[PDB]
Amino acid sequence: GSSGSSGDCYKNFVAKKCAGCKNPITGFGKGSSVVAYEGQSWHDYCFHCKKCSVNLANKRFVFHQEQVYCPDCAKKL
Ligand SMILES: [Zn+2]
Ligand SMILES: [Zn+2]
């Protein structure tokens, strides 16, 4: 861990892994389309409702049960 420093755990810099596909958010160039909230991040294609499957990329949503739900679906919750 931090103090124990056991095993072979050595890193220099880790990127914010998506909270939907569980993958590294790479992309070195000119332009980027990814959402961020509370530190976490979500690809433009990953950021979507977990009920109707609507693209909420850079749009309004509602965090609930460690998930995301558009203002509409949120009303059902
Ligand atoms: Zn993703
Ligand atoms: Zn929805």
PDB file of N, CA, C and O and ligand atoms in Angstrom:
ATOM      1  N   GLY A   1       0.806  -1.207   0.000  1.00  0.00           N
ATOM      2  CA  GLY A   1       0.000   0.000   0.000  1.00  0.00           C
ATOM      3  C   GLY A   1       0.842   1.261   0.000  1.00  0.00           C
ATOM      4  O   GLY A   1       1.601   1.508  -0.936  1.00  0.00           O
ATOM      5  N   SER A   2       0.708   2.059   1.053  1.00  0.00           N
ATOM      6  CA  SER A   2       1.458   3.304   1.169  1.00  0.00           C
ATOM      7  C   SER A   2       2.651   3.134   2.106  1.00  0.00           C
ATOM      8  O   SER A   2       3.782   3.468   1.756  1.00  0.00           O
ATOM      9  N   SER A   3       2.387   2.613   3.301  1.00  0.00           N
ATOM     10  CA  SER A   3       3.436   2.402   4.291  1.00  0.00           C
ATOM     11  C   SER A   3       4.066   1.021   4.129  1.00  0.00           C
ATOM     12  O   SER A   3       5.288   0.887   4.078  1.00  0.00           O
ATOM     13  N   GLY A   4       3.221  -0.002   4.049  1.00  0.00           N
ATOM     14  CA  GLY A   4       3.712  -1.359   3.894  1.00  0.00           C
ATOM     15  C   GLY A   4       4.672  -1.499   2.730  1.00  0.00           C
ATOM     16  O   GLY A   4       5.745  -2.087   2.868  1.00  0.00           O
ATOM     17  N   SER A   5       4.286  -0.959   1.578  1.00  0.00           N
ATOM     18  CA  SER A   5       5.117  -1.031   0.383  1.00  0.00           C
ATOM     19  C   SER A   5       5.518  -2.474   0.086  1.00  0.00           C
ATOM     20  O   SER A   5       6.676  -2.757  -0.223  1.00  0.00           O
ATOM     21  N   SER A   6       4.551  -3.381   0.181  1.00  0.00           N
ATOM     22  CA  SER A   6       4.802  -4.795  -0.073  1.00  0.00           C
ATOM     23  C   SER A   6       4.613  -5.124  -1.551  1.00  0.00           C
ATOM     24  O   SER A   6       4.284  -4.252  -2.355  1.00  0.00           O
ATOM     25  N   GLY A   7       4.823  -6.388  -1.901  1.00  0.00           N
ATOM     26  CA  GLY A   7       4.669  -6.812  -3.281  1.00  0.00           C
ATOM     27  C   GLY A   7       5.467  -5.952  -4.242  1.00  0.00           C
ATOM     28  O   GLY A   7       6.407  -5.267  -3.839  1.00  0.00           O
ATOM     29  N   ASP A   8       5.093  -5.990  -5.516  1.00  0.00           N
ATOM     30  CA  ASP A   8       5.781  -5.209  -6.538  1.00  0.00           C
ATOM     31  C   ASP A   8       4.855  -4.150  -7.128  1.00  0.00           C
ATOM     32  O   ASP A   8       4.524  -4.192  -8.313  1.00  0.00           O
ATOM     33  N   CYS A   9       4.439  -3.204  -6.293  1.00  0.00           N
ATOM     34  CA  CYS A   9       3.549  -2.136  -6.732  1.00  0.00           C
ATOM     35  C   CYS A   9       4.308  -0.821  -6.876  1.00  0.00           C
ATOM     36  O   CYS A   9       4.524  -0.107  -5.897  1.00  0.00           O
ATOM     37  N   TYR A  10       4.711  -0.508  -8.103  1.00  0.00           N
ATOM     38  CA  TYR A  10       5.449   0.719  -8.375  1.00  0.00           C
ATOM     39  C   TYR A  10       4.893   1.429  -9.605  1.00  0.00           C
ATOM     40  O   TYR A  10       4.891   0.879 -10.706  1.00  0.00           O
ATOM     41  N   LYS A  11       4.421   2.656  -9.409  1.00  0.00           N
ATOM     42  CA  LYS A  11       3.862   3.444 -10.501  1.00  0.00           C
ATOM     43  C   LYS A  11       4.425   4.862 -10.492  1.00  0.00           C
ATOM     44  O   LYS A  11       5.050   5.285  -9.520  1.00  0.00           O
ATOM     45  N   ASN A  12       4.199   5.591 -11.579  1.00  0.00           N
ATOM     46  CA  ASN A  12       4.683   6.962 -11.695  1.00  0.00           C
ATOM     47  C   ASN A  12       3.526   7.929 -11.931  1.00  0.00           C
ATOM     48  O   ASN A  12       3.538   9.059 -11.441  1.00  0.00           O
ATOM     49  N   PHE A  13       2.529   7.478 -12.684  1.00  0.00           N
ATOM     50  CA  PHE A  13       1.365   8.303 -12.986  1.00  0.00           C
ATOM     51  C   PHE A  13       0.263   7.472 -13.634  1.00  0.00           C
ATOM     52  O   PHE A  13       0.484   6.810 -14.648  1.00  0.00           O
ATOM     53  N   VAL A  14      -0.927   7.511 -13.042  1.00  0.00           N
ATOM     54  CA  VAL A  14      -2.065   6.762 -13.562  1.00  0.00           C
ATOM     55  C   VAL A  14      -3.189   7.698 -13.990  1.00  0.00           C
ATOM     56  O   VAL A  14      -3.490   8.676 -13.306  1.00  0.00           O
ATOM     57  N   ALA A  15      -3.808   7.391 -15.126  1.00  0.00           N
ATOM     58  CA  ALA A  15      -4.901   8.203 -15.644  1.00  0.00           C
ATOM     59  C   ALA A  15      -6.232   7.795 -15.021  1.00  0.00           C
ATOM     60  O   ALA A  15      -6.358   6.707 -14.458  1.00  0.00           O
ATOM     61  N   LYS A  16      -7.224   8.673 -15.124  1.00  0.00           N
ATOM     62  CA  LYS A  16      -8.546   8.404 -14.572  1.00  0.00           C
ATOM     63  C   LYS A  16      -9.284   7.364 -15.410  1.00  0.00           C
ATOM     64  O   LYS A  16      -9.772   7.664 -16.500  1.00  0.00           O
ATOM     65  N   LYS A  17      -9.365   6.143 -14.894  1.00  0.00           N
ATOM     66  CA  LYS A  17     -10.047   5.059 -15.592  1.00  0.00           C
ATOM     67  C   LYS A  17     -11.554   5.290 -15.614  1.00  0.00           C
ATOM     68  O   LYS A  17     -12.159   5.611 -14.589  1.00  0.00           O
ATOM     69  N   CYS A  18     -12.156   5.124 -16.786  1.00  0.00           N
ATOM     70  CA  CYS A  18     -13.593   5.312 -16.942  1.00  0.00           C
ATOM     71  C   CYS A  18     -14.364   4.498 -15.907  1.00  0.00           C
ATOM     72  O   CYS A  18     -13.891   3.462 -15.440  1.00  0.00           O
ATOM     73  N   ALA A  19     -15.555   4.972 -15.555  1.00  0.00           N
ATOM     74  CA  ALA A  19     -16.392   4.288 -14.578  1.00  0.00           C
ATOM     75  C   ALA A  19     -17.541   3.554 -15.259  1.00  0.00           C
ATOM     76  O   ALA A  19     -18.581   3.305 -14.649  1.00  0.00           O
ATOM     77  N   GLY A  20     -17.349   3.210 -16.529  1.00  0.00           N
ATOM     78  CA  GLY A  20     -18.379   2.508 -17.272  1.00  0.00           C
ATOM     79  C   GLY A  20     -17.828   1.338 -18.063  1.00  0.00           C
ATOM     80  O   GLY A  20     -18.413   0.253 -18.071  1.00  0.00           O
ATOM     81  N   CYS A  21     -16.700   1.555 -18.731  1.00  0.00           N
ATOM     82  CA  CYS A  21     -16.071   0.511 -19.531  1.00  0.00           C
ATOM     83  C   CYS A  21     -14.844  -0.053 -18.819  1.00  0.00           C
ATOM     84  O   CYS A  21     -14.338  -1.117 -19.179  1.00  0.00           O
ATOM     85  N   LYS A  22     -14.370   0.667 -17.809  1.00  0.00           N
ATOM     86  CA  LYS A  22     -13.204   0.240 -17.045  1.00  0.00           C
ATOM     87  C   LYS A  22     -11.961   0.195 -17.929  1.00  0.00           C
ATOM     88  O   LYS A  22     -11.282  -0.828 -18.009  1.00  0.00           O
ATOM     89  N   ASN A  23     -11.670   1.310 -18.589  1.00  0.00           N
ATOM     90  CA  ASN A  23     -10.508   1.397 -19.467  1.00  0.00           C
ATOM     91  C   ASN A  23      -9.845   2.767 -19.357  1.00  0.00           C
ATOM     92  O   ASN A  23     -10.447   3.741 -18.903  1.00  0.00           O
ATOM     93  N   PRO A  24      -8.576   2.846 -19.783  1.00  0.00           N
ATOM     94  CA  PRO A  24      -7.803   4.091 -19.744  1.00  0.00           C
ATOM     95  C   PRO A  24      -8.309   5.118 -20.752  1.00  0.00           C
ATOM     96  O   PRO A  24      -8.531   4.798 -21.920  1.00  0.00           O
ATOM     97  N   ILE A  25      -8.488   6.352 -20.293  1.00  0.00           N
ATOM     98  CA  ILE A  25      -8.965   7.427 -21.156  1.00  0.00           C
ATOM     99  C   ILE A  25      -7.802   8.147 -21.832  1.00  0.00           C
ATOM    100  O   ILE A  25      -7.438   9.258 -21.446  1.00  0.00           O
ATOM    101  N   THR A  26      -7.224   7.507 -22.843  1.00  0.00           N
ATOM    102  CA  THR A  26      -6.103   8.086 -23.573  1.00  0.00           C
ATOM    103  C   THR A  26      -6.588   9.023 -24.672  1.00  0.00           C
ATOM    104  O   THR A  26      -7.788   9.134 -24.921  1.00  0.00           O
ATOM    105  N   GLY A  27      -5.648   9.695 -25.329  1.00  0.00           N
ATOM    106  CA  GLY A  27      -6.001  10.614 -26.396  1.00  0.00           C
ATOM    107  C   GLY A  27      -5.106  11.837 -26.428  1.00  0.00           C
ATOM    108  O   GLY A  27      -5.493  12.911 -25.966  1.00  0.00           O
ATOM    109  N   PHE A  28      -3.905  11.675 -26.972  1.00  0.00           N
ATOM    110  CA  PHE A  28      -2.951  12.775 -27.059  1.00  0.00           C
ATOM    111  C   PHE A  28      -2.998  13.427 -28.438  1.00  0.00           C
ATOM    112  O   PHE A  28      -2.554  12.846 -29.427  1.00  0.00           O
ATOM    113  N   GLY A  29      -3.539  14.640 -28.495  1.00  0.00           N
ATOM    114  CA  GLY A  29      -3.636  15.351 -29.756  1.00  0.00           C
ATOM    115  C   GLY A  29      -4.301  16.705 -29.608  1.00  0.00           C
ATOM    116  O   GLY A  29      -4.017  17.446 -28.666  1.00  0.00           O
ATOM    117  N   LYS A  30      -5.187  17.032 -30.542  1.00  0.00           N
ATOM    118  CA  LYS A  30      -5.896  18.307 -30.513  1.00  0.00           C
ATOM    119  C   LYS A  30      -7.405  18.089 -30.451  1.00  0.00           C
ATOM    120  O   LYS A  30      -8.077  18.047 -31.481  1.00  0.00           O
ATOM    121  N   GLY A  31      -7.929  17.952 -29.238  1.00  0.00           N
ATOM    122  CA  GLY A  31      -9.355  17.743 -29.065  1.00  0.00           C
ATOM    123  C   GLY A  31      -9.663  16.584 -28.137  1.00  0.00           C
ATOM    124  O   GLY A  31      -8.911  15.612 -28.077  1.00  0.00           O
ATOM    125  N   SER A  32     -10.770  16.689 -27.409  1.00  0.00           N
ATOM    126  CA  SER A  32     -11.173  15.644 -26.476  1.00  0.00           C
ATOM    127  C   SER A  32     -12.654  15.765 -26.131  1.00  0.00           C
ATOM    128  O   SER A  32     -13.171  16.866 -25.941  1.00  0.00           O
ATOM    129  N   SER A  33     -13.332  14.625 -26.051  1.00  0.00           N
ATOM    130  CA  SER A  33     -14.754  14.601 -25.733  1.00  0.00           C
ATOM    131  C   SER A  33     -15.042  13.617 -24.604  1.00  0.00           C
ATOM    132  O   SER A  33     -15.443  12.478 -24.845  1.00  0.00           O
ATOM    133  N   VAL A  34     -14.835  14.064 -23.370  1.00  0.00           N
ATOM    134  CA  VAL A  34     -15.073  13.224 -22.202  1.00  0.00           C
ATOM    135  C   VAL A  34     -15.707  14.024 -21.069  1.00  0.00           C
ATOM    136  O   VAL A  34     -15.375  15.190 -20.857  1.00  0.00           O
ATOM    137  N   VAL A  35     -16.622  13.389 -20.344  1.00  0.00           N
ATOM    138  CA  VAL A  35     -17.302  14.041 -19.231  1.00  0.00           C
ATOM    139  C   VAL A  35     -16.599  13.750 -17.910  1.00  0.00           C
ATOM    140  O   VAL A  35     -15.990  12.694 -17.739  1.00  0.00           O
ATOM    141  N   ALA A  36     -16.685  14.695 -16.979  1.00  0.00           N
ATOM    142  CA  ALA A  36     -16.059  14.539 -15.672  1.00  0.00           C
ATOM    143  C   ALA A  36     -16.981  15.026 -14.560  1.00  0.00           C
ATOM    144  O   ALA A  36     -17.698  16.014 -14.723  1.00  0.00           O
ATOM    145  N   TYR A  37     -16.958  14.328 -13.431  1.00  0.00           N
ATOM    146  CA  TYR A  37     -17.794  14.688 -12.292  1.00  0.00           C
ATOM    147  C   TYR A  37     -17.272  14.049 -11.009  1.00  0.00           C
ATOM    148  O   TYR A  37     -16.963  12.858 -10.977  1.00  0.00           O
ATOM    149  N   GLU A  38     -17.179  14.850  -9.951  1.00  0.00           N
ATOM    150  CA  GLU A  38     -16.694  14.363  -8.666  1.00  0.00           C
ATOM    151  C   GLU A  38     -15.350  13.657  -8.822  1.00  0.00           C
ATOM    152  O   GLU A  38     -15.036  12.728  -8.080  1.00  0.00           O
ATOM    153  N   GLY A  39     -14.562  14.106  -9.794  1.00  0.00           N
ATOM    154  CA  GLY A  39     -13.262  13.507 -10.031  1.00  0.00           C
ATOM    155  C   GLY A  39     -13.312  12.410 -11.077  1.00  0.00           C
ATOM    156  O   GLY A  39     -12.384  12.259 -11.870  1.00  0.00           O
ATOM    157  N   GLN A  40     -14.397  11.643 -11.077  1.00  0.00           N
ATOM    158  CA  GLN A  40     -14.562  10.553 -12.032  1.00  0.00           C
ATOM    159  C   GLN A  40     -14.709  11.091 -13.451  1.00  0.00           C
ATOM    160  O   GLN A  40     -14.824  12.299 -13.660  1.00  0.00           O
ATOM    161  N   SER A  41     -14.704  10.186 -14.426  1.00  0.00           N
ATOM    162  CA  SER A  41     -14.833  10.571 -15.826  1.00  0.00           C
ATOM    163  C   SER A  41     -15.647   9.539 -16.600  1.00  0.00           C
ATOM    164  O   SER A  41     -15.794   8.395 -16.166  1.00  0.00           O
ATOM    165  N   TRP A  42     -16.175   9.951 -17.747  1.00  0.00           N
ATOM    166  CA  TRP A  42     -16.975   9.062 -18.582  1.00  0.00           C
ATOM    167  C   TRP A  42     -16.907   9.483 -20.046  1.00  0.00           C
ATOM    168  O   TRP A  42     -17.187  10.634 -20.385  1.00  0.00           O
ATOM    169  N   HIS A  43     -16.534   8.545 -20.910  1.00  0.00           N
ATOM    170  CA  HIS A  43     -16.430   8.820 -22.340  1.00  0.00           C
ATOM    171  C   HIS A  43     -17.743   9.376 -22.882  1.00  0.00           C
ATOM    172  O   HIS A  43     -18.804   9.185 -22.286  1.00  0.00           O
ATOM    173  N   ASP A  44     -17.665  10.065 -24.015  1.00  0.00           N
ATOM    174  CA  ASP A  44     -18.846  10.648 -24.639  1.00  0.00           C
ATOM    175  C   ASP A  44     -19.866   9.569 -24.987  1.00  0.00           C
ATOM    176  O   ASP A  44     -21.070   9.826 -25.027  1.00  0.00           O
ATOM    177  N   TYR A  45     -19.377   8.359 -25.239  1.00  0.00           N
ATOM    178  CA  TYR A  45     -20.246   7.241 -25.588  1.00  0.00           C
ATOM    179  C   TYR A  45     -20.635   6.446 -24.345  1.00  0.00           C
ATOM    180  O   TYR A  45     -21.642   5.736 -24.337  1.00  0.00           O
ATOM    181  N   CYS A  46     -19.830   6.571 -23.295  1.00  0.00           N
ATOM    182  CA  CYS A  46     -20.088   5.865 -22.045  1.00  0.00           C
ATOM    183  C   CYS A  46     -21.104   6.622 -21.194  1.00  0.00           C
ATOM    184  O   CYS A  46     -21.941   6.016 -20.523  1.00  0.00           O
ATOM    185  N   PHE A  47     -21.024   7.948 -21.226  1.00  0.00           N
ATOM    186  CA  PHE A  47     -21.935   8.788 -20.457  1.00  0.00           C
ATOM    187  C   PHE A  47     -23.348   8.725 -21.031  1.00  0.00           C
ATOM    188  O   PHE A  47     -23.671   9.422 -21.994  1.00  0.00           O
ATOM    189  N   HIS A  48     -24.186   7.884 -20.433  1.00  0.00           N
ATOM    190  CA  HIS A  48     -25.565   7.730 -20.884  1.00  0.00           C
ATOM    191  C   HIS A  48     -26.427   7.104 -19.791  1.00  0.00           C
ATOM    192  O   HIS A  48     -25.917   6.438 -18.888  1.00  0.00           O
ATOM    193  N   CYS A  49     -27.735   7.320 -19.879  1.00  0.00           N
ATOM    194  CA  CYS A  49     -28.668   6.779 -18.898  1.00  0.00           C
ATOM    195  C   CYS A  49     -28.545   5.260 -18.812  1.00  0.00           C
ATOM    196  O   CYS A  49     -28.188   4.598 -19.786  1.00  0.00           O
ATOM    197  N   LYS A  50     -28.843   4.714 -17.637  1.00  0.00           N
ATOM    198  CA  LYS A  50     -28.768   3.274 -17.422  1.00  0.00           C
ATOM    199  C   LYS A  50     -30.154   2.641 -17.485  1.00  0.00           C
ATOM    200  O   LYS A  50     -30.386   1.571 -16.923  1.00  0.00           O
ATOM    201  N   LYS A  51     -31.075   3.311 -18.172  1.00  0.00           N
ATOM    202  CA  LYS A  51     -32.438   2.813 -18.312  1.00  0.00           C
ATOM    203  C   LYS A  51     -32.913   2.923 -19.756  1.00  0.00           C
ATOM    204  O   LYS A  51     -33.261   1.924 -20.385  1.00  0.00           O
ATOM    205  N   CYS A  52     -32.923   4.146 -20.279  1.00  0.00           N
ATOM    206  CA  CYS A  52     -33.355   4.387 -21.651  1.00  0.00           C
ATOM    207  C   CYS A  52     -32.159   4.421 -22.598  1.00  0.00           C
ATOM    208  O   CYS A  52     -32.319   4.371 -23.818  1.00  0.00           O
ATOM    209  N   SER A  53     -30.961   4.508 -22.028  1.00  0.00           N
ATOM    210  CA  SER A  53     -29.738   4.552 -22.822  1.00  0.00           C
ATOM    211  C   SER A  53     -29.699   5.805 -23.689  1.00  0.00           C
ATOM    212  O   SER A  53     -29.591   5.725 -24.913  1.00  0.00           O
ATOM    213  N   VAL A  54     -29.788   6.966 -23.046  1.00  0.00           N
ATOM    214  CA  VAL A  54     -29.760   8.239 -23.757  1.00  0.00           C
ATOM    215  C   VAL A  54     -28.407   8.923 -23.607  1.00  0.00           C
ATOM    216  O   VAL A  54     -27.796   8.886 -22.539  1.00  0.00           O
ATOM    217  N   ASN A  55     -27.944   9.549 -24.684  1.00  0.00           N
ATOM    218  CA  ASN A  55     -26.661  10.243 -24.672  1.00  0.00           C
ATOM    219  C   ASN A  55     -26.744  11.524 -23.848  1.00  0.00           C
ATOM    220  O   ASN A  55     -27.322  12.521 -24.283  1.00  0.00           O
ATOM    221  N   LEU A  56     -26.161  11.491 -22.655  1.00  0.00           N
ATOM    222  CA  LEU A  56     -26.167  12.649 -21.767  1.00  0.00           C
ATOM    223  C   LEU A  56     -24.802  13.327 -21.748  1.00  0.00           C
ATOM    224  O   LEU A  56     -24.460  14.031 -20.798  1.00  0.00           O
ATOM    225  N   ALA A  57     -24.025  13.113 -22.805  1.00  0.00           N
ATOM    226  CA  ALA A  57     -22.698  13.707 -22.911  1.00  0.00           C
ATOM    227  C   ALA A  57     -22.765  15.225 -22.795  1.00  0.00           C
ATOM    228  O   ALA A  57     -23.328  15.899 -23.657  1.00  0.00           O
ATOM    229  N   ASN A  58     -22.189  15.758 -21.721  1.00  0.00           N
ATOM    230  CA  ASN A  58     -22.186  17.198 -21.492  1.00  0.00           C
ATOM    231  C   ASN A  58     -23.607  17.726 -21.326  1.00  0.00           C
ATOM    232  O   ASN A  58     -23.904  18.865 -21.686  1.00  0.00           O
ATOM    233  N   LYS A  59     -24.482  16.891 -20.776  1.00  0.00           N
ATOM    234  CA  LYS A  59     -25.873  17.271 -20.560  1.00  0.00           C
ATOM    235  C   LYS A  59     -26.264  17.095 -19.096  1.00  0.00           C
ATOM    236  O   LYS A  59     -25.432  16.743 -18.260  1.00  0.00           O
ATOM    237  N   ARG A  60     -27.535  17.339 -18.794  1.00  0.00           N
ATOM    238  CA  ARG A  60     -28.036  17.205 -17.432  1.00  0.00           C
ATOM    239  C   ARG A  60     -28.290  15.741 -17.086  1.00  0.00           C
ATOM    240  O   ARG A  60     -28.723  14.958 -17.933  1.00  0.00           O
ATOM    241  N   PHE A  61     -28.017  15.376 -15.838  1.00  0.00           N
ATOM    242  CA  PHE A  61     -28.214  14.006 -15.381  1.00  0.00           C
ATOM    243  C   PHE A  61     -28.475  13.967 -13.878  1.00  0.00           C
ATOM    244  O   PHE A  61     -28.574  15.005 -13.226  1.00  0.00           O
ATOM    245  N   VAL A  62     -28.587  12.758 -13.335  1.00  0.00           N
ATOM    246  CA  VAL A  62     -28.836  12.581 -11.909  1.00  0.00           C
ATOM    247  C   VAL A  62     -28.128  11.340 -11.378  1.00  0.00           C
ATOM    248  O   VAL A  62     -28.491  10.212 -11.713  1.00  0.00           O
ATOM    249  N   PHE A  63     -27.115  11.555 -10.545  1.00  0.00           N
ATOM    250  CA  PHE A  63     -26.355  10.452  -9.966  1.00  0.00           C
ATOM    251  C   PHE A  63     -27.169   9.735  -8.892  1.00  0.00           C
ATOM    252  O   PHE A  63     -27.670  10.360  -7.956  1.00  0.00           O
ATOM    253  N   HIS A  64     -27.295   8.420  -9.035  1.00  0.00           N
ATOM    254  CA  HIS A  64     -28.048   7.617  -8.078  1.00  0.00           C
ATOM    255  C   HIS A  64     -27.611   6.156  -8.132  1.00  0.00           C
ATOM    256  O   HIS A  64     -27.410   5.599  -9.211  1.00  0.00           O
ATOM    257  N   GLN A  65     -27.465   5.542  -6.962  1.00  0.00           N
ATOM    258  CA  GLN A  65     -27.050   4.147  -6.878  1.00  0.00           C
ATOM    259  C   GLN A  65     -25.774   3.910  -7.678  1.00  0.00           C
ATOM    260  O   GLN A  65     -25.678   2.950  -8.441  1.00  0.00           O
ATOM    261  N   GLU A  66     -24.795   4.791  -7.496  1.00  0.00           N
ATOM    262  CA  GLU A  66     -23.524   4.677  -8.202  1.00  0.00           C
ATOM    263  C   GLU A  66     -23.746   4.585  -9.709  1.00  0.00           C
ATOM    264  O   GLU A  66     -22.943   3.992 -10.428  1.00  0.00           O
ATOM    265  N   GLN A  67     -24.840   5.176 -10.177  1.00  0.00           N
ATOM    266  CA  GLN A  67     -25.167   5.159 -11.598  1.00  0.00           C
ATOM    267  C   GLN A  67     -25.636   6.533 -12.065  1.00  0.00           C
ATOM    268  O   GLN A  67     -25.666   7.487 -11.288  1.00  0.00           O
ATOM    269  N   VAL A  68     -26.000   6.627 -13.340  1.00  0.00           N
ATOM    270  CA  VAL A  68     -26.468   7.886 -13.910  1.00  0.00           C
ATOM    271  C   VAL A  68     -27.853   7.728 -14.527  1.00  0.00           C
ATOM    272  O   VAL A  68     -28.150   6.716 -15.163  1.00  0.00           O
ATOM    273  N   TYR A  69     -28.698   8.735 -14.335  1.00  0.00           N
ATOM    274  CA  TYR A  69     -30.055   8.707 -14.870  1.00  0.00           C
ATOM    275  C   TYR A  69     -30.522  10.112 -15.240  1.00  0.00           C
ATOM    276  O   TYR A  69     -30.563  11.008 -14.397  1.00  0.00           O
ATOM    277  N   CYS A  70     -30.875  10.296 -16.507  1.00  0.00           N
ATOM    278  CA  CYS A  70     -31.340  11.589 -16.993  1.00  0.00           C
ATOM    279  C   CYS A  70     -32.458  12.132 -16.106  1.00  0.00           C
ATOM    280  O   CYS A  70     -33.126  11.392 -15.384  1.00  0.00           O
ATOM    281  N   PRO A  71     -32.668  13.456 -16.163  1.00  0.00           N
ATOM    282  CA  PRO A  71     -33.705  14.127 -15.374  1.00  0.00           C
ATOM    283  C   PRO A  71     -35.054  13.420 -15.467  1.00  0.00           C
ATOM    284  O   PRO A  71     -35.791  13.338 -14.485  1.00  0.00           O
ATOM    285  N   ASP A  72     -35.368  12.912 -16.653  1.00  0.00           N
ATOM    286  CA  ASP A  72     -36.628  12.211 -16.874  1.00  0.00           C
ATOM    287  C   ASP A  72     -36.677  10.915 -16.071  1.00  0.00           C
ATOM    288  O   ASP A  72     -37.472  10.779 -15.140  1.00  0.00           O
ATOM    289  N   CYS A  73     -35.822   9.965 -16.437  1.00  0.00           N
ATOM    290  CA  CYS A  73     -35.768   8.679 -15.752  1.00  0.00           C
ATOM    291  C   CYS A  73     -35.626   8.871 -14.245  1.00  0.00           C
ATOM    292  O   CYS A  73     -36.204   8.124 -13.457  1.00  0.00           O
ATOM    293  N   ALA A  74     -34.852   9.878 -13.853  1.00  0.00           N
ATOM    294  CA  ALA A  74     -34.635  10.170 -12.442  1.00  0.00           C
ATOM    295  C   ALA A  74     -35.960  10.337 -11.706  1.00  0.00           C
ATOM    296  O   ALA A  74     -36.074  10.005 -10.526  1.00  0.00           O
ATOM    297  N   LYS A  75     -36.961  10.856 -12.409  1.00  0.00           N
ATOM    298  CA  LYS A  75     -38.280  11.068 -11.823  1.00  0.00           C
ATOM    299  C   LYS A  75     -38.909   9.741 -11.407  1.00  0.00           C
ATOM    300  O   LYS A  75     -39.686   9.684 -10.454  1.00  0.00           O
ATOM    301  N   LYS A  76     -38.567   8.678 -12.126  1.00  0.00           N
ATOM    302  CA  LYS A  76     -39.096   7.352 -11.831  1.00  0.00           C
ATOM    303  C   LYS A  76     -38.426   6.762 -10.594  1.00  0.00           C
ATOM    304  O   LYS A  76     -39.005   5.924  -9.902  1.00  0.00           O
ATOM    305  N   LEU A  77     -37.204   7.206 -10.320  1.00  0.00           N
ATOM    306  CA  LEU A  77     -36.455   6.723  -9.165  1.00  0.00           C
ATOM    307  C   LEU A  77     -37.011   7.311  -7.872  1.00  0.00           C
ATOM    308  O   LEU A  77     -36.257   7.658  -6.962  1.00  0.00           O
TER     309      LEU A  77
HETATM  310 ZN    ZN B   1     -15.667   4.535 -20.943  1.00  0.00          ZN
HETATM  311 ZN    ZN B   2     -33.110   7.749 -19.074  1.00  0.00          ZN
END
